[PDB]
């Protein structure tokens, strides 16, 4: 949409295209052509201010797709090959959508957001009291599966932060299309946390490997960004 399908041969796909990736930091891709007419290679700008988010000050982070057809497509090819050995486990998607809002204060548009886990660092982080995140099953001590009156609290958003930020998106006329994809490929963050204190004992194993279920992504908290 935005490409003139009324057929007279003239170079005017007005569509606005930018690319943002995120990890513990926030990563942007400058895609504009050089001022001298040369085919400039893209520049990735790591931005580590996940508390006070700002735009790393460049004017090519949101460029027209028709005039930068080459610059966008190859940048899509290089992004998987660039984040290969990125061993970062944490993410700050709440700061990433705030940074997305900074890009299109003057334009608006959509945010094709691809998130895998809830944010663990940065802004818009939500913690749930009572230990209700283990209802799907991550602990084995008798404390969360005998109260069926509190499962309705699992279905509403835990905090009032996300609907307030969604209101800020509404005034800037910006929509969010979420794509939540929990990983089932044996995430090592569930057992690699630095410990101190007390036990041992017994009897190893043999069979029926795992029955891997989807990890709890707290989808109810992240609903207001699209709803």
């Amino acid at each position: 949409p935005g490409c003139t399908d009324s057929g007279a041969g003239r170079g005017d796909s007005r569509t606005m295209v930018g690319i943002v990736t995120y990890d513990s930091a926030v990563h942007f891709y400058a895609l504009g052509s050089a001022s001298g007419g040369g085919k400039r290679r893209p520049q990735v700008l790591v931005m580590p201010e996940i508390d006070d988010v700002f735009l790393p000050l460049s004017d090519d982070l949101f460029v027209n797709f028709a005039e930068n057809r080459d610059a966008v497509l190859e940048a899509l090819d290089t992004i998987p090959s660039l984040w290969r050995s990125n061993g970062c486990i944490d993410n700050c998607m709440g700061s990433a959508v705030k940074a997305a809002l900074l890009v299109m204060k003057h334009v608006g548009g959509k945010i094709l957001l691809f998130a895998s886990f809830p944010p663990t660092v940065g802004a818009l982080v939500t913690k749930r009291s009572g230990g209700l995140a283990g209802a799907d099953g991550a602990g084995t001590d008798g404390g969360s599966r005998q109260q069926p009156d509190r499962e309705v609290e699992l279905l509403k958003p835990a905090s009032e932060a996300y609907q307030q930020f969604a209101q800020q998106l509404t005034q800037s006329q910006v929509s969010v299309d979420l794509f939540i994809a929990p990983s089932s490929c044996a995430s090592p963050a569930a057992g690699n946390v630095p410990p101190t204190g007390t036990y041992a004992g017994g009897k190893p194993g043999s069979g029926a490997p795992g029955l891997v279920t989807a990890p709890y992504c707290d989808l109810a908290t992240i609903l207001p960004l699209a709803e």
Binding site: A25, R41, L45, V46, L57, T78, S81, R84, S85
Partner: protein, 791 residues
């Protein structure tokens, strides 16, 4: 005693070789005791050993050839405190009058110290491995015009060739933002560059920067050397720090591409506004990364700046072009144009302070026709021992040769620069250390050898200097504390000792120990008069002048100058009372009043016709130069070429009479090598006498300065402006600024008004008149003799 041979042998020069015996005489001299010491001077008899150096153990007095010469039981007391230590068993069983150890025959001895076990702060160093090679952290400005960045790119691509391939390197490019570029990583991501971005107008601490970049030390990082299977990992740097710091030979390609893509600040700068410049933030990011990664290790931060800092910390000006920057009358007289200098001052002194405590040097290669902020910038180099190279562009020869001599190697292929120097001094009970003026910081190491009097950085026997080179000279000030002359026996020789525990670029600890002897005078005062050098004493009171201008007014420094000059001349001259014609000065005292004459007219004490940044370059090089370098900048030296004299050029004093039209004058003021051609010679070569073979002797004389100018451009750091000019040209203003006028208005309107009128052929030779309000030279000795005789 040959003072020139003494500096050639031990790298030092004392204002007195015969010293005042008592403190009553030491103040009667009115010149404080001082010595210029170069801890890395190329000695003519420098000798190297590796073993354990034998000091006074409980004290630290290295075994000079001046100790006890005990033979019957093979002990040695010390030169100081005399407490009877003994040779070890191997150090004695081959002793005799002919077989005597190396450092007990010669004063200047290098100790390349054998390496101890790795000191639990660089994890992964094996027993027997050298310390990692030094680092260069290029912090380059990008807010200048495109051709200016092209010359800066070309000079930088030369620079990456000149350091040794094993040295560490990192780069930060700063504009409105602070882009720390990524250099490490695997071979899978060579084609794409990365840049961590820091906001210019925000205050970032060293704690905050390290936590943002992951360089913060983890509190639970104990997996000590316990992973077998890591393939060929470099243990000197953890992989967190490896993403910004890499060897030159390993990231040579990606550094080439980074300098290739180096484009300007892409901000649309308003036509009534300055470019957005976070110079203070960019230096904070460089120093914070270097502190976490490279603590107490040889580093140098090469800051290439091309203007004023307008962003965040270290800000010096506002954004609008309507408000100009400060100048020297704004500093004295209280203006709004410098409303931001203060927050830049404590900022640049505090980031100097972790640079001292972590042993990182700082270089500032300021390059702009416009000023840059060098008055605030000077404190960052003066504490860490670094140099300042201020030029009018990144492209003029003053930058191009200074950068390439900053990577100039010795005869063995390593840099002529020590790092993290440890200069401690041990002295007698008859004289104590007051302090040090130079590129070093007092660390407050208390002891029994410190005096009460503070002269600069004092209250310690030991100084840290993160950067030293072959021309780094630091003054040491002394005070004799003997109350009565009867306590000193005849023939009593007092001693002093310097030792510099620095890092040669090979990666091992060195120890330059230089020790001397000096003899006090007899109770008679005048016995110190033959033992005075005028060039070395002139340097220390120049350094005292430039230190006293930092706190007191430069006018009051002038009053302290000539009141000490009057007291010194009146006491050391042989004259009759109320008789100026009977005045006479000895050979050691006859040129020193002329040293102070041009001292008061150099830019170190006079702020006229010079920006505070132009003077900032002057004090910074003054505070680290040697004695030969200091007399050049305090008095410009003029050489002469003519057919009438055969052989060497002769020194001619700086007057308009030296501008007789058939000469070549070589002006040398440490900052302008001026080869100036005479008026009649320009008349000869206008039609080309040197071009045609009738007057080829003119061509031979014209190329005669093209060897002495080349050899002094080769010997000089920083390299001066080489200007070749003629008479009447626009480039002759550099010579005319230093040339005094021979005729004043007082000599013309003071008499002789009728016997000049009617004779002779319409003028003669066209004399050039120079107008100034300065007192002429000859009148000054007339005033100084009259004041000294009357006093």
């Amino acid at each position: 005693m040959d003072v020139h041979e003494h500096e050639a042998a031990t790298g030092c020069r004392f204002s007195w070789n015969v010293w005042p015996a008592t403190r009553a005489e030491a103040q009667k001299i009115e010149l404080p005791l001082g010595c210029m010491f170069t801890p890395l001077r190329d000695c003519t008899s420098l000798q190297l050993v590796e073993y354990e150096p034998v000091r006074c153990r409980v004290s630290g007095c290295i075994l000079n050839p001046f100790c006890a010469i005990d033979f019957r039981s093979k002990q040695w007391t010390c030169p100081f405190s005399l407490q009877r230590n003994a040779f070890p068993n191997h150090y004695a069983m081959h002793i005799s009058e002919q077989n005597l150890p190396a450092e007990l025959l010669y004063p200047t001895i290098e100790y390349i110290l054998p390496q101890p076990m790795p000191a639990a702060n660089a994890p992964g160093v094996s027993a027997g491995e050298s310390l990692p090679p030094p680092l260069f952290f290029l912090v380059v400005d990008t807010c200048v015009i495109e051709e200016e960045l092209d010359q800066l790119r070309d000079s930088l691509m030369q620079a990456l060739a000149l350091m040794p391939s094993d040295a560490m390197v990192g780069i930060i490019t700063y504009g409105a933002m602070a882009m720390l570029h990524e250099l490490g990583g695997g071979s899978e991501n060579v084609d794409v560059m990365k840049a961590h971005v820091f906001r210019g107008n925000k205050e970032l601490t060293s704690t905050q920067i390290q936590q943002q970049l992951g360089l913060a030390r983890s509190a639970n990082a104990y997996v000590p050397a316990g992973g077998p299977g890591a393939p060929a990992g470099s243990p000197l740097l953890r992989p967190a720090a490896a993403r910004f710091i890499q060897p030159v030979g390993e990231c040579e390609y990606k550094l080439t591409s980074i300098l290739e893509e180096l484009r300007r600040d892409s901000w649309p700068v308003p036509s009534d506004s300055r470019p957005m410049r976070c110079t203070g933030l960019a230096l904070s990011v460089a120093l914070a990364v270097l502190e976490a990664a490279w603590y107490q290790l040889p580093a140098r931060v090469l800051l290439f700046v091309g203007g004023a800092c307008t962003s965040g910390p270290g800000q010096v000006v506002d954004l609008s072009l309507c408000e100009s920057i400060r100048h020297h009358l704004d500093l004295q007289k209280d203006n709004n144009n410098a409303r931001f200098v203060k927050k830049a001052l404590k900022y640049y002194t505090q980031l100097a302070n972790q640079a001292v405590r972590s042993g990182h040097a700082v270089d500032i290669f300021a390059c702009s026709l416009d000023q840059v902020g060098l008055y605030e910038m000077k404190v960052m180099t003066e504490k860490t021992g670094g140099c300042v190279v201020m030029g009018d562009s990144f492209s003029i020869n003053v930058f191009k040769d200074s950068l390439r001599k900053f990577f100039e190697t010795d005869s063995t292929g390593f840099l002529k620069m020590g790092f993290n120097a440890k200069i401690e001094v041990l002295c007698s009970k008859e004289f104590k250390v007051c302090g040090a003026i130079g590129p070093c910081t007092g660390t407050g190491k208390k002891g029994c050898q410190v005096s009460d009097t503070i002269v600069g950085e004092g209250m310690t026997t030991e100084w840290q200097a993160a950067a030293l080179d072959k021309e780094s000279t630091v003054a040491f000030y002394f005070e004799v504390t003997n109350q009565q002359a009867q306590n000193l026996p005849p023939g009593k020789q007092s001693f002093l000792q310097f030792q510099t525990s620095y890092l040669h670029p090979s990666g091992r600890r060195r120890l330059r120990v230089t020790t001397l002897s000096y003899r006090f005078a007899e109770p008679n005062t005048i016995d110190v008069a033959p033992g005075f050098d005028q060039e070395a004493a002139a340097v220390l009171m120049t350094r005292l002048a430039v230190f006293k201008t930092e706190s007191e007014e430069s006018l009051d420094v002038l009053r302290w100058l000539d009141r000490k000059l009057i007291r010194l001349v009146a006491r050391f001259a042989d004259y009759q009372k109320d008789d100026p014609s009977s005045f006479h000065l000895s050979t050691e005292f006859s040129i020193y009043p002329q040293f102070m004459y041009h001292l008061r007219r150099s830019h170190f004490l006079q702020t006229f016709n010079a920006s505070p940044d132009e003077t900032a370059y002057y004090r910074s090089v003054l505070l680290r130069a040697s004695v030969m370098n200091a007399l050049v900048m305090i008095q410009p030296a003029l050489l002469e070429y003519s057919f009438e004299q055969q052989g060497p050029p002769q020194p001619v004093l700086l007057d308009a009479q030296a501008l007789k039209p058939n000469v070549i004058l070589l002006l040398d003021s440490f900052f302008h090598v001026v080869v100036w051609h005479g008026e009649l010679i320009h008349q000869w070569r206008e039609q080309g006498f040197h071009n045609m073979p009738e007057y080829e002797n003119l061509r031979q004389l014209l190329q005669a300065p093209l060897e002495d100018a080349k050899v002094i451009l080769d010997e000089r750091f920083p390299v001066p402006k080489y200007v070749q000019c003629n008479s009447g040209g626009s480039q002759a203003r550099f010579l005319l600024a230093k040339v005094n006028p021979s005729t004043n208005y007082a000599q013309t309107a003071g008499g002789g008004a009728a016997m000049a009128g009617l004779m002779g052929d319409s003028g003669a030779a066209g004399e050039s008149f120079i107008n100034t309000d300065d007192v002429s030279l000859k009148v000054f000795m007339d005033h100084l003799i009259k004041l000294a005789v009357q006093s």
